[PDB]
Amino acid sequence: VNPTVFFDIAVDGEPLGRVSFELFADKVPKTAENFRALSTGEKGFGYKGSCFHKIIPGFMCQGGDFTRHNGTGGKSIYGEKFEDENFILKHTGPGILSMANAGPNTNGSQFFICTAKTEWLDGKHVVFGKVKEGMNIVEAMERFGSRNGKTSKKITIADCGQLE
């Protein structure tokens, strides 16, 4: 019953491929739900059209700032911010999907996809999903990043929604 959502990823507008994700609703219901809803855009805003504004090769690709596209924006579907649901799940390797934040209980809409084991984030970021299909696309994405996270082409979610 875990949901599956997808991003049609594009680079300066040119389709790269579809990545799909398993959201672990069975362990972090509220967090999975937030990402699911923002992927369908059913609440009237969401991820369609936003970019990955920070990609650091060999570390992670971060996105989800759909209000300001630069790491300052984003909102949850619950209000402005919500709490750390739990730290059951660990950053075990590439493909892990996890919440960006600015300290305890500051979950918005921003997230990142690990491109390695990043266990130093364990117990400080809530892990809630995993890539599933199209890890390779996220690897291709890694290559438009830089050591500081500035990206050298506009990597976008041209479309997104739920597959199941």
Curated annotation (Swiss-Prot):
Entry-annotated residues carrying Phosphoserine: S76
Enzyme Commission number(s): 5.2.1.8
Modifications after synthesis and translation: Acetylation at Lys-124 markedly inhibits catalysis of cis to trans isomerization and stabilizes cis rather than trans forms of the HIV-1 capsid. PPIA acetylation also antagonizes the immunosuppressive effects of cyclosporine by inhibiting the sequential steps of cyclosporine binding and calcineurin inhibition. Acetylation at Lys-124 favors its interaction with TARDBP.
Pfam short name (any one): Pro_isomerase
Regulation: Binds cyclosporin A (CsA). CsA mediates some of its effects via an inhibitory action on PPIase.
Residues modified to N-acetylvaline: V1
UniProt cross-references to PROSITE patterns, sorted A to Z: CSA_PPIASE_1 (PS00170), CSA_PPIASE_2 (PS50072)
Gene Ontology molecular function, alphabetical: cyclosporin A binding; heparan sulfate binding; integrin binding; peptidyl-prolyl cis-trans isomerase activity; RNA binding; unfolded protein binding; virion binding
Position(s), cross-link Glycyl lysine isopeptide (Lys-Gly) (interchain with G-Cter in SUMO2): K27, K81
Domain (PPIase cyclophilin-type) ranges: 6-162
Origin superkingdom: Eukaryota
The UniProt record lists the keyword tRNA processing: no
Documented effect of changing H125A: Loss of peptidyl-prolyl cis-trans isomerase activity and interaction with HCV NS5A. Loss of ability to stimulate MAPK/ERK phosphorylation
Localization in the cell: Cytoplasm; Secreted; Nucleus
Modified residues (N6-acetyllysine): K27, K43, K75, K81, K124, K130, K132
Linked residues for Glycyl lysine isopeptide (Lys-Gly) (interchain with G-Cter in ubiquitin): K27
Family: Belongs to the cyclophilin-type PPIase family. PPIase A subfamily.
Subunit structure: Interacts with protein phosphatase PPP3CA/calcineurin A. Interacts with PRPF19 isoform 2 (via N-terminus). Interacts with isoform 2 of BSG/CD147. Interacts with FOXO1; the interaction promotes FOXO1 dephosphorylation, nuclear accumulation and transcriptional activity. Interacts with integrin ITGA2B:ITGB3; the interaction is ROS and peptidyl-prolyl cis-trans isomerase (PPIase) activity-dependent and is increased in the presence of thrombin. Interacts with MAP3K5.
Protein's UniProt name: Peptidyl-prolyl cis-trans isomerase A
Organism: Homo sapiens (Human)
Record gene name: PPIA
